[PDB]
Amino acid sequence: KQELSTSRQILSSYEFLGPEFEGLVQEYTRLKDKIKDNRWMLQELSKSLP
Amino acid sequence: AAKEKLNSYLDLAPNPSLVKVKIEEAKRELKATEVELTTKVNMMEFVVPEPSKRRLK
């Protein structure tokens, strides 16, 4: 009950920066996820050179 | 449910202008990793004769 109360207090400070910020955060998050996927794909092709 | 919603916000300074810069940096990094992935794919072609259709060594 104490941990839930602290986390809910911090989230309330970011939610105050508007929908536009949330859009940016969503975009950033999407891009980081694609970079992570491409790096992961390059690593898997090198192990296969027999 | 409340902690998971907080970890998505931490790499981003609460400043929109600075976030746009981080987004542009992430777009450059995505183009470089895509070129490296295409080159390694082409060298793929020549090596010749011979052995069946088949073989070990």
TrEMBL record, chain A:
It comes from the Eukaryota. This is HAUS augmin like complex subunit 4 L homeolog. The gene is haus4.L.
UniProtKB/TrEMBL annotation, chain B:
It comes from the Eukaryota. It is found in: Cytoplasm, Cytoskeleton, Spindle. Belongs to the HAUS1 family. This is LOC495502 protein. It comes from Xenopus laevis (African clawed frog). The chain holds residues 231 to 287 of 287 of the full protein.
